[PDB]
């Protein structure tokens, strides 16, 4: 009968730090009618061995704020990406209040809702549960504060053989304010290098190194010779360079003009994959690689780019204009193109009787001296994911973007205490995150590129409600606008 909290949504900009509070209204049904239930592919029919899974479904729900737009309004995002060279979370504050427990009775043929109980909520800060917040699932807080949202169910996959389980599988029976401290992670880079990796040279001055210009004098027999030249501004492809572009694993090139595509079903057969334990798994999104060569921007790598759906997009077999295809154009400078080879290598030893033969490199692992940019983060895209706990990993930053962590924000589980009686709950959730910023000190003379909302005339206002009250985000928003030297 007396309020347990207030309504906090706003963003403070203090110096180099940003404090973004967000509050929403939530609704928690009762999943599995207070049960734990085995699930597997066989319940769903399990036709393919690639999709074969085994696991349990639990009544609990979980709060997931893991997407950026939960914490930033499009203005705060524009304000963030335009004025900063980097950001990263510092502290996390979380509060849960205004709990309301309703009971639904059916009297005659009509339903009645009246007050009633307790609500179970706890966090797993020892990371003893499976961590499902990193898969970019749904059920996160709505981008728009006036939306009331439903809490997702919590279930976890374990070791499987086809549909069947194995002796090494585990079963987890999961049987208000707190604060959090993010572990130290590198500042996400939100700038586009002005210079390409190959052009780092001084254009006015020669190198003192020599290369092999001519292996023959002219057309004829026994014309072999060795001639050398100075590598310089006239021919820049041959200069010696200290650093080389990052790794690549090639993607198939799909074109958004459909008549250029091959007339066959190459969607699954064609696609890049990584086999594990006999289960072919698509490579998505894959290593961070540019989407296309300049001018080829109509092409996009098959599996290699985050695709977000527009507001209202159907679930299955939607057209191309119902989905928003992001593209890593900004990182083209230091990274190979996803649809192109990493280079060529010599396949044999030349001699008098044999020509020098080279061949393509389709995939290339790390070599010493490689440099690369990671994949961008978006208004929609994820914030963090938990680094798998293993003996080893390399550059743990996740492939879908964001901040890879060995101790991410804990899972927050909630369910309605059983009494059965048809019951559900609702309330308010406020999550506060402190961010830290890195200012651009650049002395670049000409004006930067900035993210601007084009002055347009249209029926509706972008990033705002339409006549029926449906908030909508028009396009995926990148974080990379300002520039820095390579």
């Amino acid at each position, epitope marked *: 009968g007396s309020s347990s909290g207030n309504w906090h949504c706003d963003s403070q900009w203090l110096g180099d730090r940003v404090i973004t509070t967000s509050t929403r209204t939530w609704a928690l049904p009762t999943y599995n009618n207070h049960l734990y239930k085995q699930i597997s592919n066989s319940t769903s029919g399990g036709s393919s061995n690639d999709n074969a899974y085994f696991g349990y479904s639990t009544p609990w729900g979980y709060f997931d704020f893991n997407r950026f737009h939960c914490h930033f309004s499009p203005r705060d995002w524009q304000r963030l990406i335009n004025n900063n060279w980097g950001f990263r979370p510092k502290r996390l504050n979380f509060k849960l209040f205004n709990i309301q427990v309703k009971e639904v009775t059916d009297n005659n043929g009509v339903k009645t809702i009246a007050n009633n109980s307790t609500v179970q909520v706890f966090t797993d800060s020892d990371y003893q549960l499976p961590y499902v917040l990193g898969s970019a699932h749904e059920g996160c807080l709505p981008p728009f504060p006036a939306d009331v949202f439903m809490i997702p169910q919590y279930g976890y996959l374990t070791l499987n053989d086809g549909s069947q389980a194995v002796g090494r599988s585990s079963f987890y029976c999961l049987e208000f304010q707190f604060s959090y401290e993010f572990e130290n992670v590198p500042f996400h880079s939100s700038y586009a290098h002005s210079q390409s990796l190959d052009r780092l040279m001084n254009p006015l001055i020669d190198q003192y190194l020599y290369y092999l210009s001519k292996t023959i004098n002219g057309s004829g027999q026994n014309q072999q010779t060795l001639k050398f030249s100075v590598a310089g501004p006239s021919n820049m492809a041959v200069q010696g360079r200290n650093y080389i572009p990052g790794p690549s694993y090639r993607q198939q090139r799909v074109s*958004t003009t459909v008549t250029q595509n091959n007339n066959s079903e190459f969607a699954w057969p064609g696609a890049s994959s990584w086999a594990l334990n006999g289960r072919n798994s698509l490579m998505n999104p894959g290593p961070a690689m540019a989407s296309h060569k*300049e*001018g080829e921007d109509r092409f996009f790598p098959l599996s290699g780019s985050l695709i977000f759906g527009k507001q209202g997009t159907g679930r299955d077999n939607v057209d*191309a*204009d119902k989905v928003m295809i992001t593209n890593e154009e900004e990182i083209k400078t230091t990274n190979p193109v996803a649809t192109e080879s990493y280079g060529q290598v010599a396949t044999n030893h030349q001699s008098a009787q044999a020509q020098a033969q080279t061949g393509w490199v389709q995939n290339q692992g790390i070599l010493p001296g490689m440099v690369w940019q990671d994949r961008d983060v978006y208004l929609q895209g994820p914030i963090w994911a938990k680094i798998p706990h293993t003996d080893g990993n390399f550059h743990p930053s996740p492939l879908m973007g964001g901040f890879g962590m060995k101790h991410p924000p804990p899972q927050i589980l909630i369910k309605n205490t059983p009494v059965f009686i048809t019951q559900y709950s609702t309330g308010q959730v406020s999550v506060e995150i402190e961010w830290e910023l890195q200012k651009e000190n650049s002395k670049r003379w000409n004006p930067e590129i900035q993210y*601007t909302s084009n*002055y*347009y005339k*249209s*029926n509706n206002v972008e990033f705002a409600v339409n006549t029926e009250g449906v908030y909508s985000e028009p396009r995926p928003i990148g974080t990379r606008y300002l520039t820095r030297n390579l």
Partner: antibody, heavy 128, light 109 residues
């Protein structure tokens, strides 16, 4: 993916009248100029008429002036060219293009012209 | 009309090609506008060059342009079989009309 699809091309005796529509999709249709061009059989492209961003300025090629009326409904993005008093020279393939401006917020009143940006495949209008 | 452009040009693969259209009075290239279009038969024409030489996002680097005095010219390099199309030049005019040249069909051998 920005697409403009022309429609309504057909066969009409001289002196008749044809209405051509251009269905715009994928972009804001009311923020751009839109205009019609014409390719006669065995000839290069020719320009017909235009309509501004706020519909204030309607322009016409000298030849078709007074015989055509360009206008856009805007309730549902579409474009309309009313062809009246057709001649034998009005045979061709009509295209629907949109002049492309990178920034719609003008900084200066006289802006250097940048040309058409998105085109349709065009429809064939034939007179007999 | 009003922009004189050669009937057809041709070149072998790999060779550069200069297509050039000329115009009369002042209004040729009034403001910055001299614009080059690529028209494949039966498909939508593309704006190869906007401005005297600026080229849009979609266009390949091979295409280029310049305007010297009264003459503007489109220069195609690294010629290929896919560059075979019709090429038109256009310029905004003082009455806020656009004017297309007759156009050059480039047949690569």
């Amino acid at each position: 993916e920005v697409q403009l699809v022309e429609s309504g091309g057909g066969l009409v005796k001289p002196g008749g009248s044809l209405r051509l529509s251009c269905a715009a999709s994928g972009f804001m249709f009311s923020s751009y100029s839109m205009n019609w061009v014409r390719q006669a059989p065995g000839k290069g492209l020719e320009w017909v008429s235009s309509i501004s961003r706020s519909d204030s300025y309607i322009d016409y090629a000298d030849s078709v002036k007074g015989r055509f009326t360009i206008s856009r409904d805007t309730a549902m993005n579409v474009l309309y060219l009313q062809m009246d008093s057709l001649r034998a020279e009005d045979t061709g393939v009509y295209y629907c293009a949109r002049t492309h401006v990178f920034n719609m917020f003008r900084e200066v009143i006289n802006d250097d012209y940048y040309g058409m940006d998105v085109w349709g495949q065009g429809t064939t209008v034939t007179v007999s | 009309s009003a922009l004189t452009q050669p009937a057809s040009v041709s070149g072998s693969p790999g060779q550069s090609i200069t297509i050039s259209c000329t115009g009369t009075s002042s209004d040729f290239g009034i403001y910055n506008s001299v614009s080059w279009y690529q028209h494949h038969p039966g498909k939508a024409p593309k704006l190869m060059i906007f401005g005297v030489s600026n080229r849009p996002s979609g266009v390949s680097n091979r295409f280029s342009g310049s305007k010297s005095g009264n003459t503007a010219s489109l220069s195609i390099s690294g010629l290929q079989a896919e560059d075979e199309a019709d090429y038109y030049c256009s310029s905004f005019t003082a009455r806020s009309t656009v004017v297309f040249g007759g156009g050059t069909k480039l047949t690569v051998l």
